DNA sequence: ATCAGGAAGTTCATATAAAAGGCAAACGGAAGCATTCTCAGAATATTCTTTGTGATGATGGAGTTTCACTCACAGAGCTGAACATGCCTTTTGATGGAGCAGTTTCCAAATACACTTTTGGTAGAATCTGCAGGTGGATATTGAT
DNA sequence: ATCAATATCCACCTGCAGATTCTACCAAAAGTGTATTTGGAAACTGCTCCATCAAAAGGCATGTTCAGCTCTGTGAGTGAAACTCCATCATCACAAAGAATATTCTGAGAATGCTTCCGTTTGCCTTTTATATGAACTTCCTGAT
């Protein structure tokens, strides 16, 4: 009858990644007999935090650079020149993203 | 000539500088290929089991990242 | 084909809200949704093992915190505590 | 008259981001090296397996002779020799180390 | 707790240098920034620079290139700063803060202060509209810091009593600091944000600053000087 | 009510006593042995569960268990322990 | 009014609990659904890694004139071996020391 | 006195000889109370947030394991 | 006349397995560790908790002073520094390493 | 593959010494025992021991007990044998054998032997029940070796060409070996094992052997010579 | 090659803590039958890997030199192990005791289930645009008087 | 304390490969009832951890000595970087072929669901035994000459 029109629950979370998507992906992963109405809005929006404070920090390195586009040597610098994410990524490597610019002191 | 000589003194050398590394013995080759050739056959290993589980005879990219993945080895940029 | 979805466009909705005059490149979008994809395998193991741990059979936002909290090292896990936090309460109020 | 150019090497390898061993090379080492699993068939690739597994072993590679370095540069040398990376590899452990 | 040891003043004389150390202890010595501030009463707080002792990476204030040089030690956990060429503007007292990686974290945690006593256009300024008011036991005290440019919520509050180390209030434009209680209220985005104590008390009475980091040049508000009877 | 509390013991100490019928074990080793059969039952049946969502399979069977254990046993040893899960299998679907 | 019982471990020739691993597999939250021959080759897998470990480390018992297994004799069942040692490699085990390892340098 | 000092000198040479070393700079002591304290640190962190996220006020065996777990070292014999 | 007794004592510490730091030193350490996590609230701890942490971090010290000392024969040195214990904790990465 | 290169003949003088060679390739050098075995025409084949280059960790047989020692080389891939004084009663085919340090593997791969030519005990016994056979080329021959003490399936089987490496049919008494075809086949258990060849053909012409590794002493059988008409 | 003598292995009592053995309850595994539903098999379209060939210039290989490094040794000076002696934190153990973790019931808010409708995400087009390559001036070494 | 040569860096043109933008459409998310059930709260219990006193001896702290180590410098000899020139092998582009992978439909065997019954497992008592400890005996291997 007065069916009122369907809000996202992304915008109802106030969050850009999509928590449908996140609670079928709980719901279809194994993780759990079942998933709680709080768990997806949670981890979407966590999601878009370590989004969003990588994507701001390879801007910042690709504007540094003089450069409009993000690179994976941008990713690769804003991970590597920051010990949280360099310890959160720790085991993980960047495909084209190089290495730092490191030279021992003593060869110079 | 051996496919494992394929892997060439400039290109050894040019990894080590990529290392950092100012001056390179010259028995630093053999030592080189040797652990290049051991990386690789325990990737290819697992990246074949993958492979034969799945019942193909191609090796794909998420074959090599999941046999990547499960030695503590994630990449990123092909996949998953 | 198949449909073979991704984060590609949320990422992108981020990147036009943290830098509005900045694109990237095809390869490093892959490198940001393979990102998601692993610290999403990760969190959601690590809620998966604490709900089996204490005998729940519910993943809620407390076991998602719980292990947001173990994940991510030091400020990192904090300001992500507070996001998910004022995401779900401004969401239960809707 | 000779000059130095390690110094420059270093300093444009470590900024380039490019693969430093031949695809070609690569590519049959380790089809060659995928022959001994497989009981003689010869298996496919697909070119981003290659390129993936080349990514993941040079980045190896490239770690490896950081931390092998820092063993040269503790024992009071300069030049690396092979006892820095089998000592490097012996401290990293099982998984990290070998493979 | 997060302590950063500072050492006490000094009488120096004009063309020498002075090194000052900031000393930190009870967090892992690595994983934070420290930033140098000079405060001038003729000019209030004003960024000079920071250190990361992760990989020694710097970063100066462009009044402060040359002036200003920034080392680490990660044996002793210490930071020094160089000044080198004294003159008579640089008589002021330099803290050393803490602060996170993290983009929206701010300056958590103040030195006591060293008071060294001597014998530009494209930044952001921050426009405190009051400079000073006056105030009751329980009425209500709202400040605003107007920016110049598009900072998005990178703005942090602090009070300062006299000769005493800056507090965090609220970072982030909203959130509040750590054992800041719920009469603090920060609000805005963009180019408005506003400050707000709701129940007055004795203690409330300091100057109240705010600071941008949204941009790589920090800039710091003119200051508000409130008054409780 | 004192809870239900099972393990692995009397499990580990019928193989002990036909691998060494005069042979006994520790409490402190018997808790070990019950921690190495749990960690690897968790890592085979993660790594059997991975395998089955990479291939999008509802189903983790005997296959999905062999891979995992070719994929988490080093050398001989999962080569020992296929032909033993195989001559098992074997054994029960004769019956 | 029905057949005699039969357990699935000793339909399969095995002593580790097939139906105690199949109902751990089914609670586990691995799958929506565990195939019947799965828990029978993960108990087989079980028992012959516990055998192996176990035969192993009586043998260190019996090499040192003792007849019953303390964890210095499962750690030094585990650590002289490739294998094992690479499978427990990022393990800890308790009260079980470490290997007799002088460096041949300081001899 | 500290409670860092109460790791004593012959308690690390005593570990040191485990270790199978033979001779024992002064200096090693501090750095290693620093190591334990760090080590120590990182692992009650863990063990205290699964402590808290059970909703207890102790500290029970298990949650020392998983904490230990999840940090790549699995500890044999307490559970588990 | 002085004899040496660090062989005899490495040959007997090699083969003992008990605890080497004395447990009550440890369990105060322990517990004001963990009075700078929980906010103030003091938390109880069973006493397989503390042995349980006890046994994994005997085991991490020993197995560092084992890569240290590795260190320390490669440098051409007997005596082990605190350089050599940082260098492994550099090289043995951010998980095996620090922590 | 997997093979062990190992050295030529050599004809030496009592009271010298011989180190001979095995070199290997094909494998991880580190994961399996390099084993020791020796072969007069008069006593049969006799296990000597072996070293496990993992650790450098050795066991001989009481036999050769100071008689024999093994040394191993991880970076040449090469395990060394020293005989020392030399005796009229060495004038044998010494064979290096592969096998890993699992319980139910046996020695997989063999040398090709190197033959010395010296120019002038509570244990368990194996019983070939079959000396010497005739068949033709398709019937069924079955081959005993009725153990003496117990070994629970630790046992293996192996044939030898005349002048030649012997190569492993069958391992823990039923499993059968790579590249082995099923026509092999076989069972017991305890104390009592049997051998069978069903399909009989010119390379079934060899000698076939049973050798025990449940208990340390490691023993070879007597031999059972199977020929072809 | 021979004495001195403590460290190390051996062996017998032997007690005692810890491990093996026995019984009852409850709990979970098996048997049997009905229902559902997953995936192997078969047929087939469509991608994308293999392989071949010409071009072509990019770059590795080989030989020589030389100088910058490694390595062995010696001596000066530091410093950690050994050792003796007192005394003080650790440990056992003991009762009490009480905080608190685990157990049992209940029921209500929350989660799954199913159907229907809308909508947004993705694959496939046409269209724009950052950047890498390429060619010249400011600038900062690098030798060299 | 300043000139020829060269690497580094910036200004600018542009071709294009790659990013961006625009359209169906289909899969999936959201809305709406509905029945199910999990876990939080409350009362209660017995477990086990915290804290305190005696004590006692075992282990640690402290100061000295010296011999064995670290460190720095030197010189002989070695070996790796630099440089040159070509020709070999890698790369790229394209056609094609076809092997192999992905898609779609079907049904049958295999997995689940549920009920009932019984065999297994576990917790709590009850013996009994291997191993640590103590003490006397024997051998070995280093220290000394």
């Given at each position: 009858?007065?069916?009122?029109?369907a809000?996202?629950?992304?915008?109802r979370?106030?969050?850009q990644?999509?928590?449908?998507?996140?609670?079928?992906?709980?719901?279809?992963?194994?993780?759990?007999?079942?998933?709680?109405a709080?768990?997806?809005?949670?981890?979407?929006?966590?999601?878009?935090y370590?989004?969003?404070?990588i994507?701001?920090?390879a801007?910042?390195?690709?504007?540094?650079?003089?450069?409009?586009?993000?690179?994976?040597?941008h990713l690769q610098?804003?991970?590597?020149?920051?010990?949280?994410?360099?310890?959160?990524?720790?085991?993980?490597?960047?495909?084209?993203?190089?290495?730092?610019?490191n030279?021992?002191?003593?060869?110079? | 000539?051996?496919?494992?000589?394929?892997?060439?003194?400039?290109?050894?050398?040019r990894?080590?500088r990529?290392?950092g590394?100012?001056?390179?013995?010259?028995?630093?080759?053999?030592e080189?290929?040797?652990?290049?050739?051991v990386f690789?056959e325990?990737?290819i290993?697992?990246?074949?089991?993958?492979?034969?589980?799945?019942?193909?005879?191609?090796?794909?990219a998420?074959?090599?990242?999941?046999?990547?993945?499960?030695?503590?080895?994630t990449?990123?940029?092909?996949?998953? | 084909?198949?449909?073979?979805?991704?984060?590609?466009?949320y990422?992108?909705?981020?990147?036009?809200?943290?830098?509005?005059?900045?694109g990237?490149?095809?390869?490093?979008?892959?490198?940001?949704?393979?990102?998601?994809?692993?610290?999403?395998?990760?969190?959601?193991?690590?809620?998966?093992r604490?709900?089996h741990?204490?005998?729940?059979?519910?993943?809620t936002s407390?076991?998602i915190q719980?292990?947001?909290?173990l994940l991510?090292?030091?400020?990192?896990?904090?300001?992500?505590?507070?996001?998910?936090?004022?995401?779900?309460?401004?969401?239960?109020?809707? | 008259?000779?000059?130095?150019?390690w110094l420059?090497?270093?300093?444009?390898?470590?900024?380039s981001?490019?693969?430093?061993?031949?695809?070609l090379?690569?590519?049959?080492?380790?089809?060659?090296?995928?022959?001994?699993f497989?009981?003689?068939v010869?298996?496919?690739?697909?070119?981003?397996?290659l390129?993936?597994?080349q990514?993941?072993?040079?980045?190896?590679?490239?770690?490896?002779?950081?931390?092998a370095?820092?063993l040269?540069?503790?024992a009071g040398?300069?030049?690396?020799?092979?006892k820095?990376?089998?000592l490097?590899?012996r401290?990293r452990?099982?998984?990290?180390?070998?493979? | 707790?997060?302590?950063?040891?500072?050492?006490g003043?000094?009488?120096?004389?004009p063309?020498?240098?002075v090194?000052?150390?900031?000393?930190?202890?009870?967090?892992?010595?690595?994983?934070?920034?420290?930033?140098?501030?000079?405060?001038?009463?003729?000019?209030g707080?004003?960024?000079?620079?920071?250190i990361?002792?992760?990989?020694?990476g710097?970063?100066?204030?462009?009044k402060?290139?040359?002036?200003?040089t920034?080392?680490?030690?990660?044996?002793?956990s210490?930071?020094?700063?160089?000044?080198s060429?004294?003159?008579?503007?640089?008589?002021?007292?330099?803290?050393?803060?803490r602060k996170?990686?993290?983009?929206?974290?701010?300056?958590?945690y103040?030195?006591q202060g060293t008071?060294?006593?001597?014998?530009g256009?494209?930044?952001?300024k921050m426009?405190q509209?009051?400079?000073?008011?006056h105030?009751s036991?329980?009425?209500?005290?709202?400040?605003?810091?107007?920016?110049?440019?598009?900072?998005?919520?990178?703005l942090?509050?602090?009070?300062?009593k006299?000769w005493?180390?800056?507090?965090?209030l609220?970072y982030?434009?909203?959130?509040?600091?750590?054992?800041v209680?719920?009469?603090?209220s920060?609000?805005?985005?963009?180019?408005?944000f506003s400050?707000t104590?709701?129940n007055?008390?004795?203690?409330?009475?300091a100057?109240?600053?705010?600071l941008?980091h949204?941009?790589?040049?920090?800039?710091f508000?003119?200051?508000?000087?409130?008054?409780?009877?």
């Amino acid at each position: 009858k007065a069916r009122a029109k369907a809000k996202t629950r992304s915008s109802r979370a106030g969050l850009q990644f999509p928590v449908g998507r996140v609670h079928r992906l709980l719901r279809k992963g194994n993780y759990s007999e079942r998933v709680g109405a709080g768990a997806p809005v949670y981890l979407a929006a966590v999601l878009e935090y370590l989004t969003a404070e990588i994507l701001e920090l390879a801007g910042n390195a690709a504007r540094d650079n003089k450069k409009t586009r993000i690179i994976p040597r941008h990713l690769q610098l804003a991970i590597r020149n920051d010990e949280e994410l360099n310890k959160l990524l720790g085991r993980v490597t960047i495909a084209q993203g190089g290495v730092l610019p490191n030279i021992q002191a003593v060869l110079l | 000539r051996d496919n494992i000589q394929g892997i060439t003194k400039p290109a050894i050398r040019r990894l080590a500088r990529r290392g950092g590394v100012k001056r390179i013995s010259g028995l630093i080759y053999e030592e080189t290929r040797g652990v290049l050739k051991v990386f690789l056959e325990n990737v290819i290993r697992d990246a074949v089991t993958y492979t034969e589980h799945a019942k193909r005879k191609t090796v794909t990219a998420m074959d090599v990242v999941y046999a990547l993945k499960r030695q503590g080895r994630t990449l990123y940029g092909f996949g998953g | 084909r198949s449909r073979k979805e991704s984060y590609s466009i949320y990422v992108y909705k981020v990147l036009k809200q943290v830098h509005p005059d900045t694109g990237i490149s095809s390869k490093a979008m892959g490198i940001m949704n393979s990102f998601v994809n692993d610290i999403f395998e990760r969190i959601a193991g690590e809620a998966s093992r604490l709900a089996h741990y204490n005998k729940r059979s519910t993943i809620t936002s407390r076991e998602i915190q719980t292990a947001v909290r173990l994940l991510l090292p030091g400020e990192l896990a904090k300001h992500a505590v507070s996001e998910g936090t004022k995401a779900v309460t401004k969401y239960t109020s809707a | 008259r000779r000059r130095q150019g390690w110094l420059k090497e270093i300093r444009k390898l470590q900024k380039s981001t490019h693969l430093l061993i031949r695809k070609l090379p690569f590519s049959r080492l380790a089809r060659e090296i995928c022959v001994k699993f497989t009981r003689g068939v010869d298996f496919n690739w697909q070119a981003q397996a290659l390129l993936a597994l080349q990514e993941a072993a040079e980045a190896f590679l490239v770690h490896l002779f950081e931390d092998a370095y820092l063993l040269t540069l503790h024992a009071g040398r300069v030049t690396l020799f092979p006892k820095d990376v089998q000592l490097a590899r012996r401290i990293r452990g099982l998984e990290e180390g070998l493979g | 707790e997060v302590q950063l040891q500072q050492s006490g003043p000094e009488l120096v004389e004009p063309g020498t240098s002075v090194k000052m150390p900031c000393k930190a202890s009870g967090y892992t010595f690595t994983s934070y920034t420290i930033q140098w501030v000079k405060q001038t009463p003729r000019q209030g707080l004003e960024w000079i620079g920071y250190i990361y002792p992760y990989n020694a990476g710097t970063k100066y204030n462009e009044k402060f290139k040359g002036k200003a040089t920034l080392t680490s030690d990660k044996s002793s956990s210490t930071v020094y700063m160089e000044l080198s060429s004294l003159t008579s503007e640089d008589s002021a007292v330099y803290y050393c803060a803490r602060k996170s990686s993290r983009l929206r974290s701010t300056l958590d945690y103040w030195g006591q202060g060293t008071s060294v006593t001597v014998s530009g256009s494209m930044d952001i300024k921050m426009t405190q509209s009051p400079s000073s008011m006056h105030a009751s036991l329980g009425e209500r005290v709202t400040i605003t810091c107007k920016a110049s440019q598009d900072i998005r919520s990178y703005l942090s509050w602090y009070q300062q009593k006299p000769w005493k180390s800056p507090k965090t209030l609220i970072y982030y434009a909203t959130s509040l600091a750590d054992g800041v209680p719920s009469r603090f209220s920060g609000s805005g985005s963009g180019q408005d944000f506003s400050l707000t104590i709701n129940n007055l008390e004795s203690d409330d009475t300091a100057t109240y600053y705010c600071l941008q980091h949204g941009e790589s040049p920090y800039t710091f508000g003119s200051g508000t000087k409130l008054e409780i009877k």
